[PDB]
Structure formats: C-alpha cells, structure tokens
C-alpha cells in the first residue's frame with residue numbers, strides 16, 4: 001500500500017484505489033495502473049521533473065529502503081493477475097530489487113523528488129509506475 005500526496009491530489013495504484021478515491025476521481029489510466037483523486041488537505045510530497053535512472057525505493061515487505069538502477073518508462077508485458085488481464089502496461093520502469101504482493105504504493109525517489117510508485121514485481125524484480133510526465137500534478 002501507499003500513495004503520493006502533492007497539492008490537492010492523491011496518486012495511488014489504480015488497482016488499490018478505494019471507494020473514496022473513485023468518488024473524488026480526477027484521472028485514471030488502467031494501462032498505467034494509476035489513479036489520481038482530489039484531497040481537501042495540502043499534500044506533503046514534491047514530484048521530480050528529470051531523467052534520473054537511479055534512486056531509492058521503499059520496500060514495505062522488508063520495512064527498508066533500497067537503492068536501484070531502473071529502466072526508462074516503457075511498454076512492458078505484465079502477466080494476468082486478479083486485478084488485470086494479461087496486457088502491456090505503459091510508463092513502467094523495471095529494476096532489480098525485492099518486491100512481493102503488498103509492496104505496491106511504495107515510493108521511488110531521486111535527488112529531485114518523487115519519481116513513481118511500485119506497481120509490479122517478479123523474482124528479484126520490482127516495477128515502478130512513472131509519474132514524472134504528469135506535469136499537471138504541480139498546478
């Protein structure tokens with residue numbers, strides 16, 4: 001679990017969005033596993049606007065942060081799960097690192113700010129949904 005809170009927006013994995021997220025929907029994209037909802041309180045986070053490919057993510061299944069090298073956002077095949085059919089997920093970045101079911105929502109940050117959130121994983125892989133292209137989060 002986990003979310004980004006920036007301005008009057010809350011960014012979560014679309015597959016973990018709550019009834020309240022959907023009732024205050026701003027934007028969602030199943031192909032990216034992202035959903036943004038509106039908030040009444042001002043958010044605590046700031047978004048990176050950069051091309052970094054290294055950073056640090058929070059892994060809830062280890063209660064620890066790990067450094068990662070990750071690929072540029074791209075279209076990657078993701079196997080079927082209870083949440084989605086087998087499909088290509090866009091704006092996804094892969095890295096070698098631990099992740100397991102429950103770790104989605106953990107933040108990936110570089111020196112500039114929040115880069116994205118955990119969205120997929122595999123045998124020693126972790127995948128992050130990029131948010132750096134969502135310029136409107138800052139306005």
Ligand SMILES: NC(=O)[C@H]1CCCN(C(=O)[C@@H]2SCc3cccnc32)C1
Pocket residue numbers: 015033078081083084089099100101102103104119120121122123
């Ligand atoms: N974006 C998606 O389509 C997700 C939806 C939830 C299930 N998916 C996963 O990858 C799980 S959750 C993190 C993790 C880590 C190791 C193995 N499996 C997983 C795919």
Ligand SMILES: [Zn+2]
Pocket residue numbers: 048049050051052110111112113
């Ligand atoms: Zn950066």
